Each structure stands twice: as structure tokens, then as C-alpha cells.
Coordinates of C-alpha atoms and ligand atoms in Angstrom, one line a residue:
Chain A
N1 CA 16.6 2.7 11.9
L2 CA 14.8 4.6 9.1
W3 CA 15.3 8.4 8.5
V4 CA 13.7 11.0 6.2
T5 CA 15.5 11.5 2.9
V6 CA 14.6 14.5 0.7
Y7 CA 14.6 13.8 -3.0
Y8 CA 14.4 16.8 -5.4
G9 CA 13.3 15.7 -8.8
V10 CA 10.9 13.0 -7.9
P11 CA 8.6 12.2 -10.9
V12 CA 5.5 13.2 -8.9
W13 CA 2.6 15.4 -10.0
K14 CA -0.8 16.5 -8.9
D15 CA -3.8 17.6 -11.0
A16 CA -3.6 21.4 -11.1
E17 CA -4.7 24.4 -13.1
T18 CA -2.2 26.9 -14.4
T19 CA -1.8 29.8 -16.7
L20 CA -0.7 28.6 -20.1
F21 CA 1.2 30.6 -22.7
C22 CA 1.4 30.2 -26.5
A23 CA 4.0 28.9 -28.8
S24 CA 3.9 29.0 -32.6
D25 CA 5.8 27.5 -35.6
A26 CA 7.5 30.6 -37.2
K27 CA 5.9 34.0 -36.3
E28 CA 0.8 37.1 -39.9
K29 CA 1.1 40.0 -37.4
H30 CA -2.6 40.9 -38.0
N31 CA -4.0 37.5 -37.2
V32 CA -6.9 37.5 -34.7
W33 CA -5.3 34.8 -32.6
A34 CA -2.0 36.4 -32.9
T35 CA 1.1 34.2 -33.0
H36 CA 3.4 37.2 -32.4
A37 CA 4.6 37.5 -28.8
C38 CA 4.5 33.7 -28.7
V39 CA 7.7 31.7 -28.2
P40 CA 8.9 29.7 -31.2
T41 CA 8.4 26.0 -30.7
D42 CA 11.2 23.5 -30.6
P43 CA 12.3 22.4 -34.1
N44 CA 11.4 18.9 -32.9
Chain B
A1 CA 18.0 -4.4 -27.2
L2 CA 21.6 -3.3 -26.8
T3 CA 23.9 -3.0 -29.9
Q4 CA 27.2 -4.7 -29.7
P5 CA 29.7 -5.9 -32.4
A6 CA 29.3 -9.6 -33.3
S7 CA 33.1 -10.3 -33.3
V8 CA 36.6 -8.7 -33.0
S9 CA 40.0 -10.1 -33.7
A10 CA 43.7 -9.1 -33.7
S11 CA 47.1 -10.7 -33.5
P12 CA 48.8 -11.4 -30.1
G13 CA 50.0 -8.3 -28.3
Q14 CA 47.8 -5.8 -30.1
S15 CA 45.4 -3.4 -28.4
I16 CA 41.7 -3.5 -29.5
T17 CA 38.4 -2.1 -28.4
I18 CA 35.0 -3.7 -28.2
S19 CA 32.2 -1.1 -28.7
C20 CA 28.8 -1.0 -27.0
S21 CA 26.1 1.4 -28.2
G22 CA 22.9 2.1 -26.3
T23 CA 20.7 5.2 -26.2
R24 CA 20.9 8.2 -23.9
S25 CA 18.4 6.6 -21.4
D26 CA 20.4 3.4 -21.0
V27 CA 24.1 4.0 -21.4
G28 CA 24.5 7.8 -21.9
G29 CA 22.5 8.8 -18.8
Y30 CA 23.9 6.1 -16.4
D31 CA 27.4 5.2 -15.5
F32 CA 26.3 1.7 -14.3
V33 CA 27.9 0.0 -17.3
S34 CA 29.7 -3.4 -17.0
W35 CA 31.4 -6.0 -19.1
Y36 CA 31.5 -9.8 -18.8
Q37 CA 33.6 -12.6 -20.2
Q38 CA 32.3 -16.1 -21.1
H39 CA 35.1 -18.6 -22.1
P40 CA 33.4 -21.3 -24.2
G41 CA 31.6 -23.7 -21.8
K42 CA 32.5 -21.6 -18.7
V43 CA 30.6 -19.6 -16.1
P44 CA 30.4 -15.8 -16.9
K45 CA 32.8 -13.6 -15.0
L46 CA 32.8 -9.9 -14.4
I47 CA 35.5 -7.9 -16.4
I48 CA 34.5 -4.3 -15.8
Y49 CA 31.9 -2.4 -13.7
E50 CA 30.8 1.2 -13.4
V51 CA 32.5 2.0 -16.7
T52 CA 36.0 2.3 -15.3
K53 CA 36.2 0.1 -12.3
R54 CA 37.7 -3.5 -12.1
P55 CA 37.0 -6.2 -9.5
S56 CA 39.8 -7.9 -7.7
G57 CA 41.3 -10.7 -9.7
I58 CA 41.0 -9.1 -13.1
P59 CA 44.3 -7.7 -14.6
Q60 CA 44.6 -4.1 -15.5
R61 CA 44.8 -5.0 -19.2
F62 CA 41.0 -4.6 -19.3
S63 CA 40.2 -0.9 -19.3
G64 CA 36.6 0.4 -19.7
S65 CA 35.6 3.8 -21.1
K66 CA 32.5 5.7 -21.9
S67 CA 31.7 8.8 -23.9
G68 CA 28.4 10.2 -25.1
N69 CA 26.0 7.3 -25.5
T70 CA 28.8 4.8 -26.4
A71 CA 30.8 2.6 -24.0
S72 CA 33.8 0.5 -24.9
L73 CA 36.2 -2.1 -23.4
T74 CA 39.8 -1.7 -24.3
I75 CA 41.9 -4.9 -24.2
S76 CA 45.7 -4.1 -24.5
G77 CA 47.8 -7.2 -25.0
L78 CA 45.6 -10.0 -26.2
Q79 CA 46.5 -13.4 -24.9
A80 CA 45.2 -16.8 -26.0
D81 CA 43.5 -17.0 -22.5
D82 CA 41.3 -14.1 -23.6
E83 CA 39.5 -16.0 -26.5
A84 CA 36.1 -15.6 -25.1
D85 CA 32.6 -14.2 -25.8
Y86 CA 32.5 -10.6 -24.4
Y87 CA 29.2 -9.1 -23.3
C88 CA 28.2 -5.6 -22.6
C89 CA 25.7 -4.8 -19.8
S90 CA 24.1 -1.6 -18.6
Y91 CA 21.1 -0.2 -16.8
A92 CA 18.0 0.1 -18.9
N93 CA 16.1 3.3 -18.6
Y94 CA 13.6 2.1 -15.9
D95 CA 13.6 -0.9 -13.6
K96 CA 15.4 -3.0 -16.3
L97 CA 18.8 -4.3 -17.2
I98 CA 20.0 -4.8 -20.8
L99 CA 22.7 -6.9 -22.2
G100 CA 24.5 -6.8 -25.6
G101 CA 24.5 -9.6 -28.1
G102 CA 28.0 -10.9 -27.3
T103 CA 31.3 -10.3 -29.0
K104 CA 33.4 -13.3 -30.0
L105 CA 37.0 -12.4 -29.6
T106 CA 39.7 -14.4 -31.4
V107 CA 43.5 -14.1 -31.4
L108 CA 45.1 -14.3 -34.8
Chain C
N1 CA -14.5 22.2 -30.5
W2 CA -11.4 22.8 -28.4
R3 CA -12.1 19.8 -26.2
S4 CA -12.0 17.7 -29.3
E5 CA -8.4 18.7 -29.7
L6 CA -7.4 18.9 -26.0
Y7 CA -8.9 15.6 -25.2
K8 CA -5.5 14.0 -25.0
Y9 CA -4.1 16.6 -22.6
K10 CA -4.1 17.0 -18.9
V11 CA -2.3 19.7 -17.0
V12 CA -0.4 18.6 -13.9
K13 CA 1.8 20.4 -11.4
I14 CA 5.1 18.8 -10.7
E15 CA 5.9 18.1 -7.1
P16 CA 9.7 17.6 -7.3
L17 CA 10.2 17.5 -3.5
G18 CA 9.6 14.0 -2.0
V19 CA 10.4 12.5 1.4
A20 CA 11.0 8.8 1.9
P21 CA 12.5 6.5 4.5
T22 CA 16.1 5.5 4.0
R23 CA 19.1 4.1 6.0
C24 CA 21.0 7.4 6.0
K25 CA 21.8 9.6 8.9
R26 CA 23.1 13.0 7.8
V27 CA 19.1 17.2 -22.0
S28 CA 15.4 16.9 -21.2
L29 CA 14.9 13.3 -22.4
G30 CA 13.2 11.3 -19.7
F31 CA 12.1 14.5 -17.9
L32 CA 9.2 12.8 -16.0
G33 CA 10.3 9.3 -16.8
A34 CA 10.1 6.7 -14.1
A35 CA 6.8 8.3 -13.0
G36 CA 5.2 5.0 -13.5
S37 CA 8.2 3.1 -12.3
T38 CA 9.0 2.1 -8.8
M39 CA 10.9 4.3 -6.4
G40 CA 14.7 3.8 -6.4
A41 CA 14.7 3.3 -10.1
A42 CA 12.9 6.7 -10.1
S43 CA 15.6 8.1 -7.7
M44 CA 18.3 7.6 -10.3
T45 CA 16.7 10.1 -12.7
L46 CA 16.6 13.0 -10.3
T47 CA 19.3 15.0 -12.3
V48 CA 17.1 15.3 -15.4
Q49 CA 13.9 16.0 -13.4
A50 CA 15.6 18.7 -11.4
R51 CA 16.8 20.4 -14.6
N52 CA 14.3 22.0 -16.9
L53 CA 12.2 23.1 -14.0
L54 CA 13.2 26.7 -14.7
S55 CA 13.0 26.8 -18.5
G56 CA 10.9 23.7 -19.3
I57 CA 11.5 20.8 -21.6
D58 CA -0.9 41.1 -28.3
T59 CA -1.2 42.1 -24.7
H60 CA -3.1 38.9 -23.8
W61 CA -0.4 36.5 -24.9
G62 CA 2.3 38.7 -23.3
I63 CA 0.6 38.8 -20.0
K64 CA 0.1 35.0 -20.1
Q65 CA 3.8 34.6 -20.8
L66 CA 4.6 36.9 -17.9
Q67 CA 2.2 35.0 -15.6
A68 CA 3.7 31.7 -16.8
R69 CA 7.3 32.9 -16.2
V70 CA 6.5 34.5 -12.8
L71 CA 4.7 31.3 -11.7
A72 CA 7.5 29.1 -12.9
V73 CA 10.0 31.2 -10.9
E74 CA 7.8 31.2 -7.9
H75 CA 7.4 27.5 -7.8
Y76 CA 11.1 26.9 -8.6
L77 CA 12.1 29.1 -5.7
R78 CA 9.6 27.7 -3.3
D79 CA 11.1 24.3 -3.9
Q80 CA 14.7 25.6 -3.7
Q81 CA 13.8 27.5 -0.6
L82 CA 12.4 24.4 1.0
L83 CA 15.7 22.6 0.1
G84 CA 17.6 25.5 1.7
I85 CA 15.8 25.6 5.0
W86 CA 16.1 21.8 5.1
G87 CA 19.9 22.0 4.6
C88 CA 19.5 20.4 1.2
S89 CA 20.2 23.4 -1.1
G90 CA 22.2 21.5 -3.7
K91 CA 22.4 17.8 -2.8
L92 CA 19.5 16.5 -5.0
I93 CA 19.5 13.4 -2.7
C94 CA 19.6 14.9 0.8
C95 CA 19.8 12.6 3.7
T96 CA 18.5 14.2 6.9
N97 CA 18.4 13.7 10.7
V98 CA 14.6 13.2 11.0
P99 CA 13.8 9.6 12.2
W100 CA 11.1 8.0 10.3
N101 CA 7.8 7.8 12.2
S102 CA 6.0 4.5 11.7
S103 CA 2.7 6.4 12.0
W104 CA 3.5 8.1 8.7
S105 CA 4.1 4.8 6.8
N106 CA 5.2 1.3 7.8
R107 CA 5.8 -0.6 4.6
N108 CA 9.0 -2.6 5.6
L109 CA 11.1 -0.1 3.5
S110 CA 11.5 -2.7 0.7
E111 CA 7.9 -2.1 -0.5
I112 CA 8.5 1.6 -0.8
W113 CA 11.6 1.3 -2.9
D114 CA 11.0 -1.9 -4.9
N115 CA 7.2 -2.0 -5.5
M116 CA 5.8 1.4 -4.8
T117 CA 6.0 4.3 -7.2
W118 CA 6.6 7.9 -6.3
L119 CA 3.1 8.8 -7.3
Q120 CA 1.7 6.1 -5.0
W121 CA 4.0 7.2 -2.2
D122 CA 2.9 10.8 -2.6
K123 CA -0.7 9.8 -2.5
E124 CA -0.1 7.8 0.8
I125 CA 2.1 10.4 2.5
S126 CA 0.1 13.5 1.4
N127 CA -1.5 13.6 4.9
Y128 CA 1.9 13.6 6.6
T129 CA 4.1 15.6 4.2
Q130 CA 3.5 18.8 6.2
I131 CA 4.5 17.1 9.4
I132 CA 7.7 15.8 7.8
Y133 CA 8.5 19.2 6.4
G134 CA 7.8 20.7 9.9
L135 CA 10.3 18.3 11.5
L136 CA 12.8 18.9 8.7
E137 CA 12.6 22.7 9.3
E138 CA 11.7 23.4 12.9
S139 CA 13.6 20.6 14.5
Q140 CA 16.6 19.2 12.7
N141 CA 17.9 21.9 10.3
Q142 CA 17.8 24.9 12.6
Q143 CA 19.0 22.8 15.5
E144 CA 21.8 21.4 13.3
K145 CA 22.8 24.8 12.1
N146 CA 22.7 26.2 15.7
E147 CA 24.8 23.3 16.9
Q148 CA 27.3 23.9 14.0
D149 CA 27.4 27.5 15.3
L150 CA 28.1 26.6 18.9
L151 CA 31.9 27.0 18.4
Chain D
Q1 CA 33.2 -17.1 -0.5
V2 CA 29.8 -17.2 -2.4
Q3 CA 28.2 -20.5 -3.1
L4 CA 25.3 -20.6 -5.6
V5 CA 23.8 -24.1 -6.2
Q6 CA 21.2 -24.5 -8.9
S7 CA 18.8 -27.5 -9.6
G8 CA 19.5 -29.9 -12.4
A9 CA 18.5 -29.6 -16.0
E10 CA 14.8 -30.2 -16.9
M11 CA 13.2 -31.2 -20.1
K12 CA 9.7 -29.6 -20.8
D13 CA 7.2 -29.9 -23.6
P14 CA 6.0 -26.6 -25.1
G15 CA 3.4 -25.0 -22.8
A16 CA 4.7 -26.7 -19.6
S17 CA 6.0 -24.7 -16.7
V18 CA 9.4 -25.3 -14.9
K19 CA 10.6 -24.1 -11.5
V20 CA 14.4 -23.5 -11.4
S21 CA 15.8 -23.2 -7.8
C22 CA 19.0 -21.3 -6.7
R23 CA 20.1 -21.9 -3.2
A24 CA 22.8 -19.6 -1.8
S25 CA 25.3 -19.3 1.0
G26 CA 28.4 -17.4 2.0
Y27 CA 26.5 -14.0 2.4
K28 CA 23.5 -12.8 4.3
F29 CA 20.5 -13.8 2.0
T30 CA 18.4 -10.7 2.8
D31 CA 21.2 -8.2 2.1
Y32 CA 21.5 -9.0 -1.6
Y33 CA 19.1 -9.3 -4.5
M34 CA 19.1 -12.5 -6.6
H35 CA 19.4 -12.0 -10.3
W36 CA 18.4 -14.4 -13.1
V37 CA 19.7 -14.3 -16.7
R38 CA 19.1 -16.5 -19.8
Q39 CA 21.9 -17.7 -22.1
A40 CA 20.3 -19.2 -25.2
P41 CA 22.6 -21.5 -27.2
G42 CA 24.2 -20.0 -30.3
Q43 CA 23.3 -16.4 -29.4
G44 CA 23.7 -13.7 -26.8
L45 CA 22.9 -13.4 -23.1
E46 CA 19.5 -12.0 -22.0
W47 CA 18.5 -10.6 -18.6
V48 CA 15.5 -12.3 -17.0
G49 CA 15.0 -10.5 -13.7
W50 CA 15.9 -9.8 -10.1
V51 CA 14.2 -10.3 -6.7
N52 CA 14.7 -8.3 -3.5
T53 CA 14.9 -11.1 -1.0
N54 CA 14.2 -8.7 1.9
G55 CA 10.6 -8.3 0.9
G56 CA 10.4 -10.5 -2.1
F57 CA 9.9 -7.7 -4.7
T58 CA 10.7 -8.5 -8.3
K59 CA 11.6 -6.9 -11.6
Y60 CA 11.5 -8.7 -15.0
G61 CA 12.7 -8.0 -18.5
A62 CA 10.0 -6.7 -20.9
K63 CA 10.3 -10.0 -22.9
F64 CA 9.5 -12.0 -19.7
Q65 CA 6.6 -10.0 -18.3
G66 CA 3.6 -12.2 -17.8
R67 CA 5.4 -15.5 -18.3
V68 CA 8.0 -15.5 -15.5
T69 CA 7.3 -15.5 -11.7
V70 CA 10.3 -15.1 -9.3
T71 CA 9.8 -15.9 -5.6
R72 CA 12.1 -16.4 -2.7
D73 CA 12.2 -18.5 0.5
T74 CA 14.1 -16.7 3.3
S75 CA 14.1 -19.8 5.6
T76 CA 16.0 -22.0 3.1
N77 CA 17.8 -19.1 1.4
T78 CA 16.5 -20.3 -2.0
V79 CA 15.2 -18.2 -4.9
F80 CA 12.8 -19.9 -7.4
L81 CA 12.4 -18.9 -11.1
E82 CA 9.1 -20.2 -12.4
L83 CA 8.9 -20.1 -16.2
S84 CA 5.4 -20.5 -17.7
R85 CA 4.1 -21.0 -21.2
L86 CA 7.5 -22.4 -22.4
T87 CA 8.1 -22.3 -26.2
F88 CA 10.9 -23.6 -28.4
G89 CA 12.7 -20.2 -28.2
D90 CA 13.0 -20.7 -24.4
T91 CA 15.7 -23.3 -24.7
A92 CA 18.6 -21.9 -22.7
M93 CA 21.0 -22.1 -19.8
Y94 CA 19.5 -20.2 -16.9
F95 CA 22.0 -18.7 -14.5
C96 CA 21.4 -17.1 -11.1
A97 CA 23.8 -14.4 -9.8
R98 CA 24.7 -12.3 -6.7
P99 CA 25.2 -8.5 -7.2
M100 CA 28.4 -6.9 -6.2
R101 CA 27.1 -4.9 -3.2
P102 CA 24.1 -4.7 -0.9
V103 CA 21.5 -2.3 -2.2
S104 CA 21.2 0.9 -0.2
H105 CA 17.6 1.7 -0.8
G106 CA 16.9 5.1 -2.3
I107 CA 20.5 6.1 -2.1
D108 CA 22.9 3.8 -4.0
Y109 CA 21.9 1.2 -6.6
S110 CA 25.3 1.0 -8.3
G111 CA 25.9 -2.4 -6.9
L112 CA 22.7 -3.9 -8.1
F113 CA 23.5 -3.9 -11.9
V114 CA 26.9 -5.6 -11.6
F115 CA 26.8 -9.4 -11.5
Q116 CA 29.8 -10.2 -9.3
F117 CA 29.2 -13.8 -8.4
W118 CA 27.7 -16.3 -10.8
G119 CA 26.2 -19.8 -10.3
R120 CA 26.8 -22.8 -12.5
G121 CA 23.5 -22.5 -14.4
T122 CA 21.1 -25.2 -15.5
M123 CA 19.6 -26.1 -18.9
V124 CA 16.0 -25.8 -19.8
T125 CA 15.3 -27.6 -23.0
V126 CA 12.1 -27.3 -25.0
Chain E
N1 CA -14.7 54.9 6.8
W2 CA -12.0 52.5 6.0
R3 CA -9.6 53.9 8.6
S4 CA -12.2 53.1 11.2
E5 CA -11.9 49.4 10.2
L6 CA -8.1 49.4 9.4
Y7 CA -7.3 51.1 12.7
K8 CA -5.8 47.9 14.1
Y9 CA -4.0 46.7 11.0
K10 CA -0.5 47.7 9.9
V11 CA 1.6 46.4 6.9
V12 CA 5.2 45.5 7.7
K13 CA 8.0 44.3 5.5
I14 CA 9.7 41.2 6.7
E15 CA 13.5 41.4 6.8
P16 CA 14.5 37.7 7.3
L17 CA 18.2 38.7 7.4
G18 CA 20.0 40.1 10.4
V19 CA 23.4 40.1 12.1
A20 CA 24.4 39.6 15.7
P21 CA 27.7 39.2 17.7
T22 CA 28.6 35.6 18.6
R23 CA 31.7 33.7 19.6
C24 CA 32.4 31.7 16.5
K25 CA 34.4 31.4 13.3
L26 CA 4.4 30.3 16.3
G27 CA 3.7 29.6 12.6
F28 CA 4.8 33.0 11.4
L29 CA 6.8 35.7 13.3
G30 CA 6.0 33.9 16.5
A31 CA 8.7 34.4 19.2
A32 CA 9.3 37.8 17.7
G33 CA 8.7 39.1 21.2
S34 CA 11.0 36.5 22.7
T35 CA 14.7 37.2 23.3
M36 CA 17.3 36.3 20.8
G37 CA 18.7 32.8 20.8
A38 CA 15.3 31.5 21.9
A39 CA 14.1 33.2 18.8
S40 CA 16.8 31.4 16.7
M41 CA 15.0 28.1 17.1
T42 CA 12.1 29.6 15.1
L43 CA 13.8 30.8 12.0
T44 CA 12.5 28.4 9.4
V45 CA 8.9 29.3 10.2
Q46 CA 9.5 32.9 8.9
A47 CA 11.6 31.7 6.0
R48 CA 8.9 29.3 4.9
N49 CA 6.4 32.3 4.6
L50 CA 8.5 34.0 2.0
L51 CA 7.4 33.3 -1.6
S52 CA 4.0 32.2 -0.2
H53 CA -8.4 44.5 -8.9
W54 CA -5.8 44.0 -11.7
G55 CA -3.6 41.1 -12.7
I56 CA -0.6 43.4 -13.3
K57 CA -0.8 44.5 -9.6
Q58 CA -0.8 40.8 -8.5
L59 CA 2.2 40.1 -10.7
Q60 CA 4.1 43.2 -9.5
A61 CA 3.4 42.0 -5.9
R62 CA 4.7 38.4 -6.7
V63 CA 7.7 39.6 -8.6
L64 CA 8.5 42.0 -5.7
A65 CA 8.3 39.1 -3.3
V66 CA 10.6 37.1 -5.6
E67 CA 13.0 40.0 -5.9
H68 CA 13.1 40.4 -2.1
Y69 CA 13.6 36.7 -1.5
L70 CA 16.4 36.6 -4.1
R71 CA 18.0 39.8 -2.8
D72 CA 18.2 38.1 0.6
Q73 CA 19.5 34.9 -1.0
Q74 CA 22.0 36.9 -2.9
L75 CA 23.1 38.5 0.3
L76 CA 23.6 35.1 1.8
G77 CA 25.5 33.7 -1.2
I78 CA 27.7 36.8 -1.6
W79 CA 28.6 36.4 2.1
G80 CA 29.3 32.7 1.7
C81 CA 26.3 31.8 3.8
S82 CA 24.0 30.3 1.1
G83 CA 21.5 27.8 2.6
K84 CA 22.9 27.9 6.2
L85 CA 20.3 30.0 8.1
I86 CA 22.9 30.5 10.9
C87 CA 26.3 31.5 9.4
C88 CA 29.5 32.7 11.1
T89 CA 31.3 35.0 8.8
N90 CA 34.7 35.5 10.5
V91 CA 34.2 39.3 10.4
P92 CA 35.0 40.8 13.8
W93 CA 32.6 42.9 15.7
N94 CA 33.6 46.6 15.8
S95 CA 32.4 47.2 19.4
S96 CA 30.7 50.5 18.4
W97 CA 27.9 48.4 17.0
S98 CA 25.8 48.5 20.2
Ligands
NAG201 C1 5.1 9.9 15.7 O1 3.8 10.3 15.4 C2 2.9 10.4 16.4 C3 1.5 10.8 15.9 O2 1.7 11.8 15.0 C4 3.4 11.3 17.5 O3 2.5 11.4 18.6 C5 4.7 10.9 18.0 O4 5.3 11.9 18.9 C6 5.7 10.8 16.8 N1 6.9 10.2 17.2 C7 8.1 10.9 17.3 C8 9.3 10.1 17.8 O5 8.2 12.1 17.1
NAG202 C1 3.1 -4.1 -6.1 O1 2.2 -3.2 -6.6 C2 1.2 -3.6 -7.4 C3 0.3 -2.5 -7.9 O2 -0.7 -2.9 -8.7 C4 0.4 -4.7 -6.7 O3 -0.6 -5.3 -7.5 C5 1.3 -5.8 -6.3 O4 0.7 -6.9 -5.6 C6 2.4 -5.3 -5.4 N1 3.3 -6.3 -5.1 C7 3.3 -7.1 -4.0 C8 4.4 -8.2 -3.9 O5 2.4 -7.1 -3.2
NAG203 C1 -6.1 11.9 4.7 O1 -7.1 12.5 5.5 C2 -8.4 12.4 4.9 C3 -9.3 13.2 5.8 O2 -10.6 13.2 5.3 C4 -8.8 11.0 4.7 O3 -10.0 10.9 4.0 C5 -7.7 10.3 3.8 O4 -8.0 9.0 3.6 C6 -6.4 10.4 4.4 N1 -5.4 9.9 3.6 C7 -4.4 9.0 4.0 C8 -3.5 8.6 2.9 O5 -4.3 8.6 5.1
NAG204 C1 7.1 36.7 27.5 O1 7.7 37.0 28.8 C2 7.5 36.1 29.8 C3 8.1 36.6 31.1 O2 7.9 35.7 32.1 C4 8.1 34.7 29.4 O3 7.8 33.7 30.4 C5 7.5 34.3 28.1 O4 8.0 33.0 27.7 C6 7.7 35.3 27.1 N1 7.2 35.0 25.8 C7 7.9 34.5 24.7 C8 7.1 34.2 23.5 O5 9.1 34.4 24.7
NAG205 C1 35.3 50.6 14.3 O1 35.3 51.0 12.9 C2 36.1 52.2 12.6 C3 35.9 52.5 11.2 O2 34.5 52.8 11.0 C4 37.5 51.9 13.0 O3 38.3 53.0 12.8 C5 37.6 51.5 14.5 O4 38.9 51.2 14.8 C6 36.7 50.3 14.7 N1 36.7 49.9 16.1 C7 37.2 48.7 16.6 C8 37.1 48.6 18.1 O5 37.6 47.8 15.9

């Protein structure tokens, strides 16, 4: 009667730790907490 | 909830469109968009479903269309029998169904 | 000092591969939307959830960017590989040949799709997901592919 | 052949509750959801909700959450819309409707959002 | 000192792709010692194990695993066998091949 259906893209999550990266607004290359090598953020 | 023109009009035999404007999550992201006709004092009937499909019993003069976040109903060849309140319907973003405010169509 | 800024935020891993009983026999707006909505309604948003899982919605920062990109690729490919070995490589809604075992969940089917959310479903099926995947892989997909190759 | 028969019009003072029935025949009751919509006089048509008769599970419009309870009786094939905390803005013709197709759970909901067969409707006056 | 402990361990690279003649147009590596055909009913157990002192070395290992997986998937796609596990390619066997 009932069969397994696989759904890719289900809005499911589990609590997890992950490596996070940085993003910045525009770019001071000498800042301690350097924002160079960060990806620009979305304009919005 | 759903934005729809309050009224449209044209002379007999002309082709008009009734617009329907929702957001990306209601109309743009789903093709489950339909149109209904309420003649004054009458039970609502289905005009269009799934943007382009028609049910049996409705003539081909009613042609639905969708682009971007905007849907429309094109009525080519207005008759006096079509003077009715036209409504837009679509799936809401989640678990909900939204309707337009109703378009009063008149034939000049 | 950082907790006072990060108090609003929780990091979660997305589990885009779900299994559920059905009647089959074989932009980033709304990315995680329907997460709090019931199943079914949350099955109509699969296209947007499946997208943006590859790209998203100073040595130290560069290595963290590299770890983040490698990890994102690793998880994307683990999920696409699971779809491949299940015979679901590009269907997004993939109906299969595994019968549903009432020992996994017996909720009259309507409760799963009309009342239950995908998060509640995942919490209830977490003890069986590995069995379901095992039957999708070891039984129906390799048997189906062998049968299709018995020309 | 779809027959949807609704109860007669009811007059209710503000704050009262009303139960509007919709009995149906011509199709298998458990194969189709029952929808309710509200047509207020002088203005547009608002969606009220739907019920999955094969399990009795319901959805409501955001405007109607916490005020409206929809239930179903599978022995008499009758769906009941219970409207609580009625106000003057709730005066309207309440229609029940049958969707175009049976819902294929988890696969195809395209037929749930199209109202193919409509009842006559009944007035609720406040 | 380490050889005396590693004497029974060997590192091998898994090659999930292979070819065999046909008439057409055990959690991990189990049934490797079984004959073919019987070992074709335990193909997804090996596939599921793909993509399973210095962070750079761990990243190189993970990128290498990803590159090997994707090279095998590229070989399947480029042959028209993407996502099939068992795929008949219509290329005749040349007889000299064993
Ligand atoms: C269903 O699950 C039970 C317990 O896991 C198992 O014994 C049984 O074999 C399963 N049924 C089928 C048809 O595979
Ligand atoms: C649906 O789920 C909610 C979760 O809070 C529960 O309270 C409700 O009773 C469930 N519905 C039915 C009809 O049991
Ligand atoms: C899964 O198994 C664990 C074993 O400790 C048990 O506590 C938990 O309740 C089980 N979950 C479900 C959903 O059956
Ligand atoms: C090993 O060989 C024996 C020979 O009788 C056979 O029965 C057995 O199944 C073989 N093992 C595997 C894993 O195929
Ligand atoms: C085997 O391949 C060679 C080319 O490498 C070809 O000349 C020969 O005819 C092939 N043999 C058969 C039996 O097809």
C-alpha cells in the first residue's frame, strides 16, 4: 500500500557544529581581524 | 492579501486582460493559479486552473497566463453573459490559499 | 561579549534527504521555508531547498574559507551520491520500490502529510532512517538496475 | 455529479458561535478534501480553510486561526464549520467546495487548490 | 617499531568502477572474495563508503576523496551511465580482453 519516497530538499535540520567563514561589507588590509580574504556580503 | 484590479470594462467583441499580482512565494513560485467567475447572485464557477488549463464546459475564450510574479486572465470576445465578478486564486506560500479582491467586469 | 551578539543565532546542518510513505510505486527566497509547516506543503518547495546547497543563500580566514567550501562540497556530494545509489539522481521527488514497514511509523499516512512537519517526521524516523536507506540501496536499487540489465 | 447541500442561514448575536454543515454525495468522501470560503457582501471572496476528510486534518487562513474549527463526520459524509467569537465583520455567505482532484499525498497537490464543484452557500448574519 | 605493529595493515585505493562482458544493450568491500554477479548485489555498500597532525593534510585528504569520487562520476556521466550503478554501454567486447 505505502512505499518509501525520497525527497531531496526537505526543510529539515539538526543541531550541528561547523567551520564558519567570514564575510565583510567592502574590503583596511592591516586590521587585526582582517576583512581581506573574506567574501563580500550580499548588497541586501 | 492578493492584489487584483477592482474593475475592468470594454465594448462587446474586444479583448481584455484581468491582472493578478502576488509575491514570488505565492504566485511566482507556484503554478497552481486559478480564476473564478461569480455572476451576480450566482454560485462561483471555475474559469481557469493551473495558469493555462480550462475545465470542461468553459469556452476557449478564457485564456490564462503567468509571467514573473504576475498572472492574468485574457478574455477575448466579451459577451453580455460574461458580466460577472472575476476572482484570482493561488497557493499561498505555506499551507494557505489566497484570493484576490474581485474584479467587476462590465460590457460597454 | 560575543555571546551577547550571537545570542540570536544557532548553527544547524540541513538534512535535505527525507524518506516518507506515499502511494507511489516506481532565487533563494524561502530557502528553508515550510520548515515549520506540515509535510506536503513542505514538499512543494523542494526546488528552492535543493538549490543554494552548493553556493548558499590572512591565513586563518583563508583556511576557514577552504574548510567551509570543502565541507559544503562534501555534504552536497554525500547527498547527491545517496540519491544516485538510490536511483534518484535528479528527480527531486523520487518514488521508490521499498514498501513502507509499519514498524517504522504507522500514522495513517494523512497525519504525516497533513499535520506532521518534516522536522517532527525526521525526529520520529531518525531511528529507522538507516534501515530505510539500507533497503533503498542494498535491495531495490541494485536489484532494479540488475533487472534492467538482464537483457 | 457532485451534490453539496448546506444548512440554512443562521442569525447570531456578536460573540455567539455557529456550526455550518455541508453534506456531500456523488464522490467518495474520503478521497477529497472539503474547502470552506467566505464571501462577505459588497467585497471580495476570502478563503476560510480546508479539511482532509481521510484523517480529519485541517488548515485555516491566518485571519481565521483560533476562531474557526473545522471537523468532519465520515459516517454521514458531512463536514462542519464551527465559527466562534463572531463579530459584525463576519457577516457573509459561507460556501463549501470540492477540489478538482483527489490529493496524492506527498506527490501531487495541484488538484487541492482548484475549487471545481461549489455548493449553494449559506448566510451567516451578525 | 611501527612496522612491527603495522605488519598486518595495508592501505588500498578503492576503484569502484569496473567493466565486464555481458549480454545486453558485508558493510564495506564484503563479497570481494565472492564471484562476480553475486558480488553485483553488494555494489551500493562500497559506493556509500565513498565521501565518508595538520588541518591542511586533512583537507588534502578530503579534497582527494572528492576528486576521486567526482572522477568516477565523470567517467559514469561521460559514458552515459550517470546514476545507474550497472550500465550497458553498447560497446562490443574485443575478445582479446581476457
Ligand atoms: C519490518 O520491520 C521488522 C522489524 O524491523 C522486520 O522484522 C521485518 O522483516 C520488516 N518487514 C519487511 C516486510 O521487510
Ligand atoms: C497536529 O499536531 C499538533 C502539534 O502541536 C497537535 O497539537 C495536534 O493535536 C495535531 N492534530 C491532531 C488532529 O491530532
Ligand atoms: C531511538 O532509540 C533510542 C535508544 O535509546 C530511544 O531512546 C529513542 O526514544 C528512540 N527514538 C524513537 C523515535 O523511537
Ligand atoms: C567462499 O567459498 C565458499 C566455497 O564453498 C562459498 O560457499 C562461500 O559462499 C564463499 N564466500 C563468499 C563470501 O562468497
Ligand atoms: C581488437 O582490437 C583491435 C584493435 O586494438 C582490432 O584490430 C581487432 O580487430 C579487435 N578484435 C576483435 C575480435 O574485434
